Each structure stands twice: as C-alpha cells, then as structure tokens.
Amino acid sequence: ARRRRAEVRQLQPDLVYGDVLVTAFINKIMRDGKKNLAARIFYDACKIIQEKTGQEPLKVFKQAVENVKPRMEVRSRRVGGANYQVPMEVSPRRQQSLALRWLVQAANQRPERRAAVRIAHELMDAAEGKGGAVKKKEDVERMAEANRAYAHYRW
C-alpha cells in the first residue's frame, strides 16, 4: 500500500437478518472456502440463543460484538533507540475485525463438541461480558494502560 490508501473490501448484506456485520462474521467461521457450512453453523447458533435464552439473538450479536471491541492497543515502533511498544487507539475499522476474529478463535477453544454450540455459548458469555474473547479485549487494553509512559511516541 505504498501509493494508495487501500480502500476497504465491501460485503453484500445478509440473506436473513439483512446485516453486513453478520456476513463479515460468517466469513470468519468459514474454513477452506465453504460458505454453506459457515452459515449453517452460525444460523444453528442463533437457534441456540433462542430456545436457551428468551432474548433476541440478533441484539446479542451487536452487544457481544461491542463488548469484545478493543478501545486501545500497543503497536511496535522504531526510534532513536531500540524497538518499543506504543499505546494508541484502534481505528473503528480495526476494532471491527479484532472483535470478529477473537470471537471465533475463543469460540473454538470452548470445549463443546459441536461447532454451533461453541459460537452460541461464547456469543452469550460474550454479551453478558464474561466471555473468553472478552478476556482478550480487556487484556489488550491492559497493555496500553501500563505502557502509557511511552504514549508520547504516538502517531
């Protein structure tokens, strides 16, 4: 991305809940190119957010996503001394991706044998706040706390 501003890949909205967030999330669940499996997993998940919990599974997702969204992070930078760790804020775009990423990877670490139940529980625990993928968002922010000394080196 030397010359350009590298404009953002844009996705077609969902065919059920009609939301881009969902598709962009669906993609991350997709192993080796299978979209069909990706949705059939996710859609079974919000089935689980229904019989289990009386709440509305869409609403959980935006919430569970907004809780696992990191507010600040520590980027490497090189200077008139050695390499450092400098705290800055995640751009809106960036916060997106990380939350979607961490969500899934956390999900797969959950012990539940079936894929949908994994993302189900995680996304629930995520929204209620106690989720493993949240432990990350938190943690990342905690790094940029302790390094606030180096926060004068930001760009």
Partner RNA sequence: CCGGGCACUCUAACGGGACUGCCCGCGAAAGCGGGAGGAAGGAGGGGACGACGUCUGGUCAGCAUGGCCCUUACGGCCUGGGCGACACACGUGCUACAAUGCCCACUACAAAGCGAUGCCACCCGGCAACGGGGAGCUAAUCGCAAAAAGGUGGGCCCAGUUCGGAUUGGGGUCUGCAACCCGACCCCAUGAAGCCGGAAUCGCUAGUAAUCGCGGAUCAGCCAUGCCGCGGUGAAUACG
| Cα 140 to the center of its chain, rounded Å | 13
Instruction: Supply the minimum distance, in Å, between the C-beta of residue 106 and RNA.
Output: 12
Instruction: Supply the minimum distance, in Å, between the C-beta of residue 45 and RNA.
Output: 11
The residue whose two tokens read 């775009």 is 93
Long-range Cβ contacts of 110-118 (<8 Å, 24+ apart)? 115/41, 116/41, 116/42, 116/44, 116/45, 116/47, 116/48, 117/45, 117/48
Instruction: Supply the minimum distance, in Å, between the C-beta of residue 15 and other proteins.
Output: 6
Q: Which is nearer to other proteins, 26 or 99 (CB)?
A: 26
**Total site size for RNA, rule CB under 7 A:** 35
Q: Which is nearer to RNA, 20 or 56 (CB)?
A: 20
Interaction residues for RNA, span 109-138 (CB under 7 A): 113-115, 118
Q: Which is nearer to other proteins, 28 or 40 (CB)?
A: 40
Q: What CA–CA distances, in Å, run from 28 to 78, 125, 137, 140?
A: 32, 19, 18, 21
Instruction: Supply the minimum distance, in Å, between the C-beta of residue 4 and RNA.
Output: 7
Beta bridge partners of 87: 74
Report the 10 Å Cβ neighbour count for 31: 9
Which H or E run includes 11? none
Binding mask 34-73 for RNA (x = CB under 7 A): xxxxx-xx--------------------------------
Which of 52, 64, 58, 54 has its CA nearest to residue 127? 64
Q: What is the contact surface with RNA in residues (CB under 7 A)?
A: 1-2, 4-6, 8-9, 11, 24, 27-38, 40-41, 75, 91, 93-94, 96-97, 100, 108, 113-115, 118
